[PDB]
């Protein structure tokens, strides 16, 4: 049965990981997780997201392909880092190494870039040119990519050691220093190096920062990352307070100020959507809250955040002519951007690790578990989240500490 009373003590401290799918009475759980990875990482052109990159017939590395029917396929740091994360959780070293080799070679901006703000950060959008060779479309970062890269690299060090192709640990510490030096304002993750007083709630994964703190080897840095963790929980708590009730109706938003206030409308040239939309990034917020509750312990704010967000989505579904909740809301109003897809349902299933409502759990969990693995033209974002959620709901998303 669903555990509707999640522990205040996290799995990171106790070593006890929940298996949500098992709580929900499912069977063949590990087989389903394993086939999800195999199909995402297999050469089937169906669920597949993991593709080789070759130059003049010489194999180089692999990438997570951000398939995109509207704008042309591209390659993103988020997807790359998520794929590495999935690989390390399932002990898939070759896949991990192939993805990391690509990131370090082709996504990383040089340390001597003329713009100091870009030095060592990872260009968020690459493409293959008309001759098949990789190039950077946009050198600016998507900072949760660097967050996941650091996380994944620290875990790779812990599981596999540092005497193979990569010194994962050194690569991870380099990544953490890049985050600190290039991607932080006042210990809050930036949306952009070029804009102050701006964060993206979906980038806040407080438990990652606690894991970073336990995996650095100097006291100042340990304290730094613990403080980032506390400030991240504060930001999320504040954001959830600010989106409660009217006018945001309990869904977190794309962009926020450092006090948690949603950003209203457009604020910069190039911005893809209004700041106050619950959109694709925002989907991940309650997933991250579930993650944090599971790994570091459920507090009242985690439970309220998820219970109210899921409650809104259920209500919104009852007020939808398609009998679905949608992908994009603004001020509690549907924006007609489609019924929830697999990735949104996956994010919401992970959020259940902070839920106290068994009825909600039954519904959101079963809506995820009944899905087939994403295929087709929208599978990048749906399929990447589906993979992560499969790990989270099967007890496979674990923190592996390094030993000093
Ligand atoms: O995310 C959606 C996806 O699940 C679907 O398959 O295609 C339409 C998208 O908007």
Alpha-helical regions (H) of 90-183: 93-102, 144-160, 168-182
* Alpha carbon of 378 to ligand 1 centroid (Å): 6
Structure tokens at 205: 């994964």
Q: Which helix (H) or strand (E) holds 53?
A: strand 50-55
Alpha-helical regions (H) of 319-392: 342-351, 358-369, 379-392
Structure tokens at 58: 């010489």
Parse the chain into domains and list their residue ranges. Answer: 1-404
Q: Which long-range contacts (CB under 8 A, 24 or more apart) does 52-60 make?
A: 52/98, 53/102, 53/106, 53/134, 55/133, 60/101, 60/102, 60/105
* Alpha carbon of 251 to ligand 1 centroid (Å): 20
Q: Which long-range contacts (CB under 8 A, 24 or more apart) does 171-174 make?
A: 171/100, 171/104, 172/215, 173/216, 174/120
Place of tokens 């596999």: 160
- Nearest residue to 151 (alpha-carbon basis) of 258, 78, 94, 220: 78
Q: How far apart are CA 230 and CA 238, in angstroms?
A: 12
**128 touches 168 (CB < 8 A):** no
Phi-psi region of 372 (alpha: psi -120 to 50; beta: other; left: phi over 0): beta
**232 touches 255 (CB < 8 A):** no
* Alpha carbon of 279 to ligand 1 centroid (Å): 13
Of all protein residues, the one whose alpha carbon is nearest to atom 6 of ligand 1 is: 378
Of all protein residues, the one whose alpha carbon is nearest to atom 4 of ligand 1 is: 341
279, 334, 341, 372, best to mutate for ligand 1 pocket (most atoms within 8 Å of CB): 341
Structure tokens at 127: 């493409």
Answer whether the bond into residue 60 is a cis peptide, omega within 30°. no
CA atoms within 13 A on the CB side of 180: 20
Phi, psi (rounded to 5 degrees) for 247: -100, -5
Partnered with residue 58 across adjacent β-strands are 55
**110 touches 119 (CB < 8 A):** yes
Q: What DSSP designation does 261 have?
A: P
* Alpha carbon of 193 to ligand 1 centroid (Å): 31
- Domain 1-404 part of CATH 1.50.10.10: yes
Q: Does any ligand 1 atom lie closer than 6 A to the CB of residue 332?
A: no
Return the number of other C-beta atoms located less than 10 Å from residue 80's C-beta.
Answer: 29
Cβ-based neighbours of 185, under 8 Å, separated by 6 or more:
196, 197, 198, 199, 258
Q: How far apart are CA 250 and CA 365, in angstroms?
A: 20
Q: Does any ligand 1 atom lie closer than 6 A to the CB of residue 383?
A: no
- Euclidean distance between the first and the last CA atom of the chain, given in angstroms as a whole number: 39
Q: What angle do CA 250, 253, 377 make, to 5 degrees?
A: 115
Q: How far apart are CA 156 and CA 83, in angstroms?
A: 13
Q: Does any ligand 1 atom lie closer than 6 A to the CB of residue 68?
A: no
* Alpha carbon of 325 to ligand 1 centroid (Å): 13
Q: How far apart are CA 289 and CA 272, in angstroms?
A: 24
**275 touches 265 (CB < 8 A):** yes
Dihedral sign of CA atoms 143, 145, 147, 149 in order: negative
Distances from the Cα of 53 to the Cαs of 75, 134, 397, in angstroms? 11, 9, 28
To one decimal, the resolution in angstroms is: 1.2
Structure tokens at 256: 């926020």
Q: Does any ligand 1 atom lie closer than 6 A to the CB of residue 52?
A: no
Task: Specify the experimental method.
Answer: X-ray
Write down how long the chain is.
404
């Amino acid at each position: 049965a669903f555990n509707n009373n999640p522990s205040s003590v996290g799995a990171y401290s106790s070593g006890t990981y929940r298996n949500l799918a098992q709580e929900m009475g499912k069977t063949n759980i590990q087989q389903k997780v394993n086939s999800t990875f195999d199909n995402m990482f297999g050469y089937n052109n169906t669920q597949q997201l993991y593709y080789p990159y070759t130059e003049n017939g010489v194999y180089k590395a692999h990438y997570i392909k951000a398939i995109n029917p509207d704008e042309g396929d591209d390659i993103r740091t988020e997807g790359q880092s998520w794929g590495m994360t999935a690989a390390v959780m399932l002990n898939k070293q070759e896949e991990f190494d192939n993805l990391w080799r690509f990131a370090k070679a082709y996504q990383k901006n040089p340390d001597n870039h003329p713009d100091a703000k870009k030095q060592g950060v990872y260009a968020w959008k690459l493409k293959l040119n008309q001759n098949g060779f990789v190039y950077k479309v946009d050198e600016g970062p998507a900072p949760d990519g660097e967050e996941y890269f650091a996380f994944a690299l620290l875990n790779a060090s812990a599981r596999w050691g540092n005497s193979g192709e990569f010194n994962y640990y050194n690569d991870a510490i380099t990544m953490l220093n890049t985050i600190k030096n290039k991607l932080m304002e006042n210990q809050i993750i930036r949306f952009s190096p070029y804009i102050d007083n701006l964060t993206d709630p979906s980038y806040h994964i407080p438990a990652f920062y606690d894991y970073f703190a336990n995996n650095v080897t100097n006291q100042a840095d340990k304290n730094y990352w613990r403080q980032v963790a506390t400030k991240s929980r504060t930001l999320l708590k504040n954001h959830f307070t600010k989106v409660s009730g009217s006018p945001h109706w309990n869904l977190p938003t794309f962009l926020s100020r450092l006090d948690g206030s949603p950003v209203i409308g457009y604020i910069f040239n190039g911005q893809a959507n209004p700041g106050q939309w619950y959109e694709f990034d925002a989907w991940r917020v309650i997933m991250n809250v579930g993650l944090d509750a599971h790994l570091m312990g459920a507090q009242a704010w985690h439970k309220s955040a998820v219970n109210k967000a899921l409650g809104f989505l259920s209500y919104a579904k009852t007020n939808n002519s398609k009998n679905c909740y949608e992908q994009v809301y603004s001020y509690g109003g549907a924006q007609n951007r489609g019924c929830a897809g697999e990735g949104q349902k996956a994010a919401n299933a992970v959020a259940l690790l902070a839920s106290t409502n068994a009825g909600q759990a039954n519904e959101f969990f079963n809506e995820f578990w009944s899905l087939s693995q994403p295929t087709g033209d929208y599978r990048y974002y749906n399929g990447s989240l589906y993979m992560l959620a499969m790990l989270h709901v099967s007890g496979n998303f674990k923190f592996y500490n390094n030993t000093f």
